[PDB]
Design a protein around this ligand. Structure first.
Ligand SMILES: Nc1nc2c(ncn2[C@@H]2O[C@H](COP(=O)(O)OP(=O)(O)OP(=O)(O)O)[C@@H](O)[C@H]2O)c(=O)[nH]1
Ligand SMILES: [Mg+2]
Ligand SMILES: [Zn+2]
Lengths: 34, 168
């Protein structure tokens, strides 16, 4: 797991693109959902 | 003795030297051919002061404008920031002020902000006067130093200044 890239700062999940990161973050870390 | 952990974020225009600054601090290294960051890189390093081990969890963000909207994800819950400009580039200093503003408006109320005037080894090509940057820092309670990731000038010093100011 690369120490650089579109890493989620909350769980350190490495995602393949910025869009996948935004998607991931909103599904798992924002206020239950949205 | 005790250990204090803090999330720290590096922000600033592309090519100002954010990844170089942190590589210097973390690894004691510097690359002339450092690659532009894609997204953000995670690094960590400690300082010690007043019996306290201060551990920085560092997010080195990509400065390119296309990544602007990702920055808030990385400075969410950040207790410290370093906004970096290039002393040979007055426009990079204008972009630095706008990052400082965004931080004032959108970051945690407790954030300790440092301002780095980087590439100070190139002082013979200076575009940004020291006292102008200092005046801006003083007026906004920013910690300001001119640094050089290349020579190592003030690199440890700026991170130590942050540590001092952070609630411990
Ligand atoms: N002379 C001099 N060159 C520096 C200094 N710091 C960084 N550089 C060089 O400036 C170029 C860009 O540095 P980076 O660390 O990659 O800049 P960055 O802010 O991380 O750029 P992005 O990741 O695109 O946002 C590289 O060639 C570095 O070697 C410095 O203090 N003095
Ligand atoms: Mg970089
Ligand atoms: Zn995550």
């Amino acid at each position: 797991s690369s120490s650089e890239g579109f890493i989620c700062p909350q769980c350190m999940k490495s995602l393949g693109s910025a869009d996948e990161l935004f998607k991931h973050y909103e599904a798992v870390h924002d206020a239950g959902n949205d | 003795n005790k250990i204090c952990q803090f999330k720290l974020v590096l922000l600033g225009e592309s090519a100002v030297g954010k990844s170089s600054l942190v590589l210097r601090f973390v690894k004691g290294q510097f690359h002339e051919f450092q690659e532009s960051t894609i997204g953000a890189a995670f690094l960590t390093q400690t300082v010690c002061l007043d019996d306290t081990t201060v551990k920085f969890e560092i997010w080195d963000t990509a400065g390119l404008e296309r990544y602007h909207s990702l920055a808030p994800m990385y400075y969410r819950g950040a207790q410290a920031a370093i906004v970096v400009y290039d002393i040979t580039n007055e426009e990079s200093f204008a972009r630095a002020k706008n990052w400082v503003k965004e931080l004032q408006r959108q970051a945690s109320p407790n954030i300790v902000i440092a301002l780095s005037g980087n590439k100070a080894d190139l002082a013979n090509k200076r575009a940004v006067d020291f006292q102008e940057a200092q005046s801006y820092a003083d007026d906004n309670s920013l910690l300001f130093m001119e640094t050089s990731a290349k020579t190592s000038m003030n690199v440890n010093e700026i991170f130590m200044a942050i540590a001092k100011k952070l609630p411990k």
